[PDB]
Amino acid sequence: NPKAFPLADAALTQQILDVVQQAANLRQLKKGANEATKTLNRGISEFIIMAADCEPIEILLHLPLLCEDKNVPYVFVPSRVALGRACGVSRPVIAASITTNDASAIKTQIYAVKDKIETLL
Amino acid sequence: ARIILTMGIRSKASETDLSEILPEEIEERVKTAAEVSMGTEITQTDLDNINALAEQIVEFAAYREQLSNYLSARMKAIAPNLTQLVGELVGARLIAHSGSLISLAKSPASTIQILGAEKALFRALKTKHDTPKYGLLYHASLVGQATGKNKGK
Amino acid sequence: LREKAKERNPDEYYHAMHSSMDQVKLLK
Amino acid sequence: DDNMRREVQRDLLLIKHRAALDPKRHYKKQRWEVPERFAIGTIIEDKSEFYSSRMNRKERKSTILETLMGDEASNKYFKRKYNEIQEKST
Amino acid sequence: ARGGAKVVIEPHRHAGVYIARGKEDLLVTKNMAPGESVYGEKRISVEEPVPPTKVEYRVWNPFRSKLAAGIMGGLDELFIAPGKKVLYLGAASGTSVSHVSDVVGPEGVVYAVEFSHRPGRELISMAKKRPNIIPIIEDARHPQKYRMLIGMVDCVFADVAQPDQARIIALNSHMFLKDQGGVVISIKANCIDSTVDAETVFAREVQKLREERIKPLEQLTLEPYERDHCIVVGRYMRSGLK
Amino acid sequence: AKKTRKFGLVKRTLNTKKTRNIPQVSSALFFQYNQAIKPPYQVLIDTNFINFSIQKKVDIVRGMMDCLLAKCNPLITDCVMAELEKLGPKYRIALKLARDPRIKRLSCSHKGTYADDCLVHRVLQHKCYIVATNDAGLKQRIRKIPGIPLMSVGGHAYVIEKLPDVF
Amino acid sequence: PIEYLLFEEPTGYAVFKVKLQQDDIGSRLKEVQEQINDFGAFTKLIELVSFAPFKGAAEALENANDISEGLVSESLKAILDLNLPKASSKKKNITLAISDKNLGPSIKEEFPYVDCISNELAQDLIRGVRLHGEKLFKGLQSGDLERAQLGLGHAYSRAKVKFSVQKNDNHIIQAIALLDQLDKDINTFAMRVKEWYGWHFPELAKLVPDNYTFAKLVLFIK
Amino acid sequence: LADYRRQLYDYLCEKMHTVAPNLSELIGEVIGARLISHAGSLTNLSKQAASTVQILKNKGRISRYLANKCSMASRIDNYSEEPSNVFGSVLKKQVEQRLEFY
Amino acid sequence: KDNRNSRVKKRKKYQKAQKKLKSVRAVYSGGQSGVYEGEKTGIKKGLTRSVKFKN
Amino acid sequence: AKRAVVLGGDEKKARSFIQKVLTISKAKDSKRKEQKASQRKERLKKLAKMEE
Ligand SMILES: [Zn+2]
Structure with a gap:
């Protein structure tokens, strides 16, 4: 059982x-591990996507702890290059955060992946 | 600090007798504490550093005791009749309040009586209450042996 | 007050029937 | 007990009538009679917010009434409304 | 609200919790281990008479602790006493369990219950710092598996977010809570049932509670500090629930 | 305490003189809207409603379905259950309808059988149900409380009163 | 037939015998829950047969870990061997009451002539034993129950999380604080040495400004 | 007492190289341990963000850069059982490359 | 002009009916934004804004 | 009569500023009670127009 949970x-x-691209299009996704920690502190991150191929796993392993603190679930991607590509940016992001907005037409999709993600956890 | 100098670990305290530092009742209290404690295991370098710290502590305590004996000798040398009257510690405390011994000789009797509680003195004289009556000389053994208005007189 | 003055009733017994300028102020 | 009574009475009474201290606060409506036990103290900050949670040192003063008089917008607000209502009175 | 202001401390209606009155009001608890902020909160500290001792009090963020609106938002009766035993199912962090320790005081004890690993590790650290906290990293769904460690706790708080919350607290109260015990359950409808409405979830929870033989005494939604939340204060009767 | 002394006293009086608790507003309550009632519905049944549904011979769950244009869930408590059980033999067929896996039994912790007090406690504590009755004083009680859907029986079918989503 | 029952504690195991069986049909009544609440009537039900504590804190934690996992322990097996009377393994087994269905079949395998019972009645009896605690022990137990709880819980939680002195950091923290206080006390006590020998020789305080070499130079030139 | 101060300081450097060697290599043993005491725990150090450790022209740019790098080093020293001074040294190398870029 | 334009008449009245929403009870608005934890308006002792479950 | 006590400087400013605050709060409280009583008398006229 590695640390890659x-x-x-x-x-x-x-x-x-794909929800990452649609939320980045609707401006519902924030970018960066330090910014993900910031919105964790803010209490507006609805869930977290992280990488697995970073330098190293630890600088983004700091995030699941605050996730279990502020009951905001999370999961890992294998490729941070793929994560930055779904973020839609030239540089490989390693951590991105789906926020909250009540007047969002994709919220059923986010609540759907929320069900699937909680059954994964 | 003596217990830290004596033992370092739970089982060492359990197999070590501590009749010198503690009586036997508190010795079996710390024995049962070592049997059921909750702390972690402290490494050898941390144990050595905290042991040198305990050495510093007992050295401070012994030096402070020797300093108190030296102060008793100094007060008996300076003002022997004050040591015969009120006590070396409270006499040196009056000396430290007044500054100089000549200034304390210049001070009248009421100043010596309320030399300690100047705060309550000037307070009560300002807001019309009872003037304090002991100040610093309450900690003398005579006023400690007295009681109440006997303490006041 | 005029009515109570007419009916004062002068035989009532109540138990409470048994009780420089700045320089002068500082003195008093 | 019977010490610092002027300072603690001024602090207590200003907290009784804190509602007029700023015209934009508009606290709740309570009577807040004098409590039986209390202890005045200063709110020690954390080192996490040295910028906005730390206040000052040359403005750290021992009375909240005294920091209200140190607050100048409340001072001019008070003197303006005070001149207003004293003109209304006289 | 700044780090140099002086406000005054009064006792609240509940025993063990205090209020700071100044230009604005703050929620106060008496610290047990003075000197360190357990999650970085602006802490007040007063003097009490030998030179006096500088006694510490800690602020209680209602936007962080779900319990703090129960005093601030206001319930009639909190089961917590300044010397009681409270079992904390769902011991997330110091932000709640240090406060419940600081309101049970040195005589009272808190039994922290958690399941995960690294928040559990930080719980081990803070429960080593404070004596009255006993930390358990055993799964809360298995009170039989942590049965050698809890004995007849007076009152329980539950902040667990699993959908079988009622079954968990049912087993835990059947085997550990004393008779006429206190329950304070924190219901999060967004985590129990995301589709149906919050008060429907709350009615389902209180009806399952009445099935599981605890008389509900009172309820609060704690609206202006946490959305889609609830707390139910209830009494484990165990004998003549009617 | 003589009457003429009292007369003098009231003339003197005229001549001289001339922990609390507030229950919160529910979070699910816009001004009179009660936005928390969406399909599926959750309804609460009365003995009077049962017997008048027998009299007008309407089906219970089919009737509330056609009246409310969606899916609905029926509830009875132990107070109204013991009230049916007290009515007994003449309403044995009403008891036969009241015992059904499709109606969901709800428990209570109450002393007595005052189903009026039971249900009005329920609606004063929840404000998420739909009451279905025929009774007059209880009707006036659920009328004087606001933001709650009453549905009574009458005529050929059921009739809803306060629900804004009538169609 | 609820003949014997077990009770785990951080100060070891306890074996009780039931003398009077409370009725199983009305186990939910006011009278039976009231006499399970009271202590004087519960003594008419439970009598201690055995009490064997754990030898040390380490074996206590090992046995508690085995209990939490749901397996049998060596001291517990010896206790059951001592206490349980060997009945016929096929008919009329001896009855033992526990609270763990996870522990049931383990004891059933380790002793074929015993039947384990974990019902609401046995759970109520175990809960009443937990309620009265040492009052059924009649002064046999030594070592405080609550202190045993705190020690065993801290040790069990640390064994589950694998606590690390490498991950400990208060050594660094107290090292910073003590170095700061130590430098402050160095300069204060050294300027006090400077005063105490400037009274005898003030031009030493004017000549050597280093406080450490000043203290050494005082020690040499008394 | 001065000798004990020296012993305690050397023990502090050893404990810093044991516990947080990458923060030690990045900024120093003593400055990292001061940041440890200022925050309260390495747990909280890896909890907080880059702006938080920054508050905890090109001078400010260098400060923000080193704050981000020390945040990452606090993360790895908090969630690595045996930290890698190779990563500590290459992190300090990038910091010194930025300092040379000044 | 509200009697002129209908949607504006609903607009400036619904929001007028919305400012009164905060008065009848505390409504949700964002959350904690600064660093302040307590209440700007004040805390009371014998208020107890809670619903009782009556037997 | 009051007790005659001399004060120097800061305490005189304290009493003057705090009596400023008392007069401010006295005016504000009188304004609140007059606005409240006007609301009561208009509410009473509307209650009369609704009862009759
Ligand atoms: Zn009922």
């Missing part, structure tokens, strides 16, 4: 990266 399979990972 929940890491999804191929199809699940695909679909969260």
Whole structure:
């Protein structure tokens, strides 16, 4: 059992990266590990996507602790290059945060992946 | 600090007798504490550092005791009749309040009686209450042996 | 007050029937 | 007990009538009679917010009435409304 | 609200909790281990008469602790006493369990219950710092598996977020809570049932509580500090629930 | 305490003189809206409603479905259950309808059988149900409380009163 | 037939015998819950047969860990061997009451002539034993129950989380604080040495400004 | 007492190289231990953010840069059982590359 | 002009009916934004804004 | 009569500023009670128009 806790399979990972692009399009996703920690402190992060191929796993392993503190679930992607590509940016992001907004038309999708993610945890 | 100098670990305290530092009742109290404690295991370097710290502590305590004996000798040398009257510690405390011994000789009797509680003195004289009556000389053994208005007189 | 003055009733017994300028102020 | 009574009475009474201290606060409506036990003390900050939670040192003063008089917008607000209502009175 | 202001401390209606009155009001608890902020909170500290001792009090963020609105938002009766035993199911962090220790005081004890690993580790650290906290890293769904460690706790708080919250507190109260015991359950409808409405979830929770033989005494939603939240204060009767 | 002394006293009086508790407003309550009633519905049944549904011969769950245009869940408490059990033999068929796996039994912790007090406690503590009755004084009680859907029986079918989503 | 029952404690195991069986049909009544609440009537039910504590804190933690996992321990097996009378393994087994269905089949395997019972009645009896605590022990137990709880819980939680002195950091913290206080006390006590020998020789305080070498130079030139 | 201060300081450097060697290599043993005492725990140090450790022109730029790098080093020293001074040294190397870039 | 334009008449009245929402009871608005934890308006002792479950 | 006590400086400013605050609060409290009584008398006229 490595420190790399929940890491999804191929199809699940695909679909969260697709909600990643749609939330980045609707400005519902924030970028960076330090910014993810910031919105964790803010209490507006609704869930967290993180990487697995970073330098090293620890600088983003600091986030699951605050996740279990502020009951905000999280999961891992295998490729941070893929995570930055679904973020839609030239540089590989390693940690991104889905926020909260009540007037969002994709909220059923986010609550759907919330069900699937909680059954994964 | 003596217990830290004596033992370092729970089982060492359990197999070590501590009749010198503690009586036997508190010795079996710390024995049962070592049998059921909750702390972690302290490494050898941390134990050595805290042991040198305990050495510093007992050295401070012994030096302070020797200093108190030296102060008793100094007060008996300076003002022997005050040592015969009120006590070396409270005499040196009056000396430290007044500054100089010549200033304390210049001070009248009421100043010596309420030399300690100047705060309550000037307070009560300002807001019309009872003037304090002991000040610093309450800690003398005579006023300690007295009681109440006997303490006042 | 005029009515109570007419009916004062002068035989009532109550138990309470048995009780420089700044320089002068500082003195008093 | 019977010490610092002027300072603690001024502090207590200003907290009784804190509602007029700023025209934009508008606290709740309570009577707040004098309590039986209390202990005055200063709110020690954390080192986490040295900028906005730390206040000052050359403005750290021993009475909240005294820091209200140190507050100048409340001072001019008070003197303005005080001149107003004393003109209304006279 | 700044780090140099002086406000005054009064006792609240509940025993063990205090209020700071100044330009604005603050929620106060008496610290047990003075000197360190357990999650970085602005702490007040007064003097009490030998030179006097500088006694510490800690602020209680209602936006952080779900319990603090129960005093601030206000219930009639809190089961917590300044010398009682309270078992804390769902011991998330010091932000709540240090406060419940600081309100049970040196005589009272808190039995922290948690399941995960690294928040549990920080719980081990803070429960080593404070004596009255006993930390358990055993799964809360298995009171039989942590049965050698808890004995007849007076009152329980529950902040667990699993959908079988009622079954968990049912087993725990059946085997550990004393008769006529106190329960304070924190219901989060967003985590219990995300589809149906919050008060429907709350009615389902109180009806399952009445099935599991605890008379509900009172309820609060704690609206202006946490959304879609609830607390139910109830009495474990065990004998003549009617 | 003589009457003429009292007369003098009231003339003197005229001549001289001339922990609390507030229950919160529910979070699910816009001004009179009660936005928390969405399909599926959750309804609460009375003995009078049962017997008048027998009299008008309407089906219970089918009737509330056609009246309320969606899915609905029925509830009775032990107070109204013991009230049916006290009515007994003449309403044995009403007891036969009241015992049903499709109606969900709800427990209570009450001393007596005053189902009026039971249900009005329920609605004063929850404000998420729909009451279905026929009784007059209780009707006036649920009328004087605001933001709650009353549905009574009458005529050929059921009739809803306070629900804004009438269609 | 609820003949014997067990009770775990951080100060070891306890074996009780039941003398009067409370009725099983009305186990939910006011009278039976009231006499399980009271202590004087519960003594008419439970009598201590055995009490064997744990030898040390380490074996206490090992046995508590085995209990939490749901397995049998060596001291517990010896206790059951001492106390349980060997009945016929096929018919009329001896009855033992526990609270753990996870522990049931383990004891059933380790002793074929015993039947383990974990019902609401046995749970109520175990809860009443937990309520009265040492009052059923009649002064046999030594070592405080609550202190044993605190020690065993801290040790069990640290064994589950694998606590690390490498991960400890208060050594660093107290090292910072003590070094700061130590430097302050160095300069204060050294300037006090400077005063105490400037009274005898003030031009030493004017000549050597280093306080450490000043103290050494005082020690040499008394 | 001065000798004991020297012993305690050297023990502090050893304990810093044992516990937080990457923070030690990045900034120093003593400055990292001061930041440890200022925060309260390495847990809280890895909990807080880059702006928080920053408050805890090109001078400010260098400060923000080193604050981000020390945040990452606090993270790895908090959640690594045996930290890698190779990573500590390459982190200090990038910091010194930025300092040379000044 | 509200009697002129209908949607504006609903607009400035619904929001007028919305400012009164905070008065009848505490409504949710964002959350904790600064560093302040307590209440700007004040805390009371014998208020107890809670519903009792009556037997 | 009051007790005659001399005060120097800071305490005189304290009493003057705090009596400023008392007069401010006295005016504000009188304004609140007059606004409240006007609301009561208008409420009473509307209650009369609704009872009759
Ligand atoms: Zn009922």
